Write a protein that binds this ligand. Structure first.
Ligand SMILES: *[C@@H]1O[C@H](CO)[C@@H](O)[C@H](O)[C@H]1NC(C)=O
Lengths: 49, 100, 49
């Protein structure tokens, strides 16, 4: 349940939804936003393991 | 210029033409600026007139309202699963079996 | 928003939160337009933070 609920954290990004970030903003900043989200989710997975 | 983005009908955007509504198959959908992939089916939820879209325990959009007709559509992902390959040694045979 | 580069050469066009580049695909609830007149040295004051 904790792993599932950790998917709504923005991790310092504009949004937690990838589609909104990709459709609302340019690739130059989309890179950093998706990097932040990906790093947060990878950290969550490693902690669970 | 200040733009308002809320859980509202959101009736101000560009000249994009709409297509027909097709159900019971995994498709790409763009419901009023909201993009996604999956199969849309008739929903049996008791939506209230002021409500626009639903949500699940996993905090994701799993129900939408058609911006043309007062219809609630449930969104589910298309089929998914894992595949395992059962083999003896390659020193023995090249035949395999597959478990979905 | 496609027809917006049809005036005098704009000196300031800065967009926060949405990429102006061919991104009229987003649907908004309402739009607010705030128009005023300032001096050139004060234009930089109109920005977050
Ligand atoms: C236009 O949109 C309104 C919104 O409720 C809807 O009732 C009506 O059926 C729509 N007309 C057509 C031709 O789709």
């Amino acid at each position: 349940n904790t792993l599932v609920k950790q998917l709504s954290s923005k991790f310092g990004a504009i949004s937690s939804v990838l589609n909104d970030i990709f459709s609302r903003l340019d690739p130059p900043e989309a890179e950093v936003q998706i990097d932040r989200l990906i790093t947060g989710r990878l950290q969550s997975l490693q902690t669970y393991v | 210029l200040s733009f308002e983005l809320l859980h509202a009908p959101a009736t101000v955007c560009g000249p994009k033409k709409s297509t027909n509504l097709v159900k019971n198959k995994c498709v790409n959908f763009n419901f009023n600026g909201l993009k996604g992939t999956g199969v849309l089916t008739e929903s049996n939820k008791k939506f209230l007139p002021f409500q626009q879209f639903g949500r699940d325990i996993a905090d994701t959009t799993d129900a939408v309202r058609d911006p043309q007709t007062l219809e609630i559509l449930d969104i589910t992902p298309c089929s998914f699963g894992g595949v395992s390959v059962i083999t003896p040694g390659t020193n023995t045979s090249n035949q395999v079996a597959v478990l979905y | 928003y496609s027809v917006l580069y049809n005036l005098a050469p704009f000196f300031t066009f800065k967009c926060y939160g949405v990429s102006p580049t061919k991104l009229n695909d987003l649907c908004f609830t309402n739009v607010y337009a705030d128009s005023f007149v300032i001096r050139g040295d004060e234009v930089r004051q109109i920005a977050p933070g």
